[PDB]
A paper describes a structure:
Here, we reveal the extended and contracted atomic structures of an intact contractile-tailed phage (φCD508) that binds to and penetrates the protective S-layer of the Gram-positive human pathogen [name]. Structures of purified φCD508 virions in both extended and contracted conformations were determined by single-particle EM of frozen-hydrated samples; the resolution ranged from 2.6 to 4.0 Å for the extended phage, and 2.9 to 4.2 Å for the contracted form.
At the base of the capsid sits a unique opening, centered on what would be a fivefold symmetry axis in a complete icosahedron; it is made up of 12 copies of portal protein gp45, forming an opening through which DNA is ejected from the capsid. Thus, there is a 5–12-fold symmetry mismatch between the capsid and the portal.
Residue numbers in the entry:
A (entry chain A): 44 to 143, 145 to 287
B (entry chain B): 13 to 43
C (entry chain X): 3 to 127
D (entry chain B): 93 to 143, 145 to 287
E (entry chain G): 16 to 127
The structure:
């Protein structure tokens, strides 16, 4: 549907009390909880080109237009499914400071990553996916593995992080108006508990249909892309870090 | 239109018997 | 559910009848004690103390409003069938006099030769 | 009641049985563990946190070893540990041989066969909240398991349903009960902090 | 034929023009004090409970301690329980005293 529907379920509540010799037992209680609601939007772009431009221009073709459509589509998917994670206003409960001691090596981000794991678990969630920027890929990837021996201290590798994904910003200049998707800020990272609170909703993944043409101008069919998608992010899953 | 429900994960957490490694069980209805 | 994946909202369904209320737990004060199947007045509740209790212990009182065989009356008084019954907390004995005593029952079977009485228990007003 | 049964078609007795089982398991944990939690430990059974000076948080290792020294010097043996889920990660890090640090390798804590992470359990019934207070975060308990802890199982659990004399509007109410008893001790417990 | 028609655990009433009841709450309607099993509107039929049962409620005046054993009186003006013992109607006796959340367990009474 255009907008989904919340799940419903009932639950009983009771507590076992001490029942001394022949007394009356106190009954329980039933209650219901409901889920949230998610919705899916529509996106589309296209091109117009005269028949003469396609026929006379050697290099132009519908193949490059489809390539541009596919690239913008993939970038749109990344933006839709990762900008809720980035643009969210994280409370102090989620956020974790840099907490690097005096003059360490930059693999002292290991301190921050370990505590981010600790705070996820203390909050009963757990981090498995780490998101960051490529500006500190070498530092982070060195940090997940055990850093070299420093002053007689061989730190251990960080476990329970299945994969790390780096999402830099995407940019494109359509005509004279540039459109930019904000990536992960350098330094800041997001440790995520995956695919429990995050749901990807799809009705039509992508459909490049040839559009209406003005035959009176000999203009070719408007190649236009179209996807009907949506996302459902959350805050219970994610924990921010610094550096 | 068709009605579809967001199959989200809710419901109270399961509770486990954590005391067992400590206590020595004695089972008898005659007690 | 702490650490749940999703911010679900819990809605309570109200329920007034906590229990059947045929009996009531009560706590013994300093100057009170009980033994099984004996009538007592504890904290404004009158009933059959089904358990023994001496000092700050918990006991339960039957208030079923059923028929009860008691004895433990003021033997001098006559108890005809139908007469009201009052509990004299000072003497800890049943009596028909209504001077300052709690109304607790009505006799179903008159005082026999051994001072036994059957009576309905009343709703603890 | 009939009204509860007729409001929502999702309702059934199965959710009530599930709630009975859940509350029963929580009660078992409460009866068997809360003697350890709520005991008024004396100076003999209490060992204080001993963070020497700006140590990495696996300085809990030296606290646990001191707890073992307290049991062994007192001729107890703390084969089992109990702590909160909050301090769980640092416990396995402390239990295992902590990583090399400033040219000082601390050996693994061996005799602790297993560790029990017991948080509380809270339920809202009507307008009353009943909470079985689990292990307080920070504080931990070390136990000699079987010698001084006897569980008495006379009747594990039995649920029954009846409508012999109930109201017309009340469907057959469901009741569960269990005969059970537990014997705790102070001969076995040492109370750790952090 | 039998004089007894029902166990009397519940009694039906008809809401007046100044009365409206919601599910599982206490309401004094036509001299019957009980727990309404239906959400009722003006001139509608609802069913109350007079079961002489132990009942839970927090709809109390929070000014005085409801120590166990004290009689509970229902004040129809303010629509609250209280231990005033004034012209307000008598409805029950406290089984469990008030907690920090101001919740009361009390036994209903036979509407005399």
């Amino acid at each position: 549907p255009q907008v989904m529907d919340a799940k419903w379920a009932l639950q009983g509540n009771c507590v076992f009390l001490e029942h001394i010799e022949g007394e009356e037992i106190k009954f329980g209680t039933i209650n219901a909880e409901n889920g949230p609601v998610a919705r899916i939007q529509t996106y589309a772009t296209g091109f117009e080109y005269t028949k003469e431009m396609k026929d006379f221009n050697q290099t132009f073709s519908v193949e490059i237009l489809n390539k541009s459509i596919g690239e913008s589509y993939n970038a749109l998917l990344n933006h839709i499914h990762l900008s809720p994670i980035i643009n969210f206003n994280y409370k102090a409960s989620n956020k974790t400071a840099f907490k690097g001691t005096n003059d360490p090596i930059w693999l002292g981000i290991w301190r921050t990553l370990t505590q981010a794991q600790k705070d996820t678990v203390i909050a009963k969630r757990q981090g498995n996916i780490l998101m960051a920027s490529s500006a500190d890929q070498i530092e982070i990837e060195m940090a997940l593995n055990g850093g070299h021996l420093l002053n007689g201290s061989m730190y251990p590798s960080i476990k329970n992080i299945s994969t790390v994904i780096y999402y830099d910003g995407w940019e494109v200049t359509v005509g004279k108006k540039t459109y930019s998707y904000k990536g992960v800020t350098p330094g800041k990272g997001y440790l995520i508990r995956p695919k429990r609170g995050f749901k990807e909703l799809i009705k039509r993944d992508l459909t490049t249909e040839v559009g209406n043409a003005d035959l009176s101008k000999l203009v070719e069919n408007q190649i236009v892309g179209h996807c009907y998608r949506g996302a459902f992010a959350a805050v219970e899953e994610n924990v921010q870090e610094i550096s | 239109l068709r009605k579809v429900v967001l199959d989200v994960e809710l419901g109270r957490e399961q509770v486990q018997l954590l005391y067992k490694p400590i206590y020595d069980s004695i089972a008898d209805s005659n007690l | 559910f702490k650490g749940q994946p999703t911010p679900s909202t819990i809605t309570q369904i109200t329920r007034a009848k906590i229990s059947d209320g045929k009996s009531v737990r009560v706590i013994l004060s300093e100057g009170e004690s009980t033994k099984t199947q004996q009538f007592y007045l504890i904290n404004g509740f009158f009933g059959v103390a089904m358990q023994d209790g001496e000092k700050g212990d918990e006991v339960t009182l039957q208030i079923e409003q059923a028929e009860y065989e008691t004895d433990n009356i003021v033997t001098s008084e006559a108890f005809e069938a139908g007469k009201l019954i009052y509990w004299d907390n000072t003497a800890k004995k049943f009596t028909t006099t209504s001077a300052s005593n709690r109304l607790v029952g009505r006799v179903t079977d008159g005082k026999d030769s051994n001072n036994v009485i059957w009576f309905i228990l009343l709703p603890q007003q």
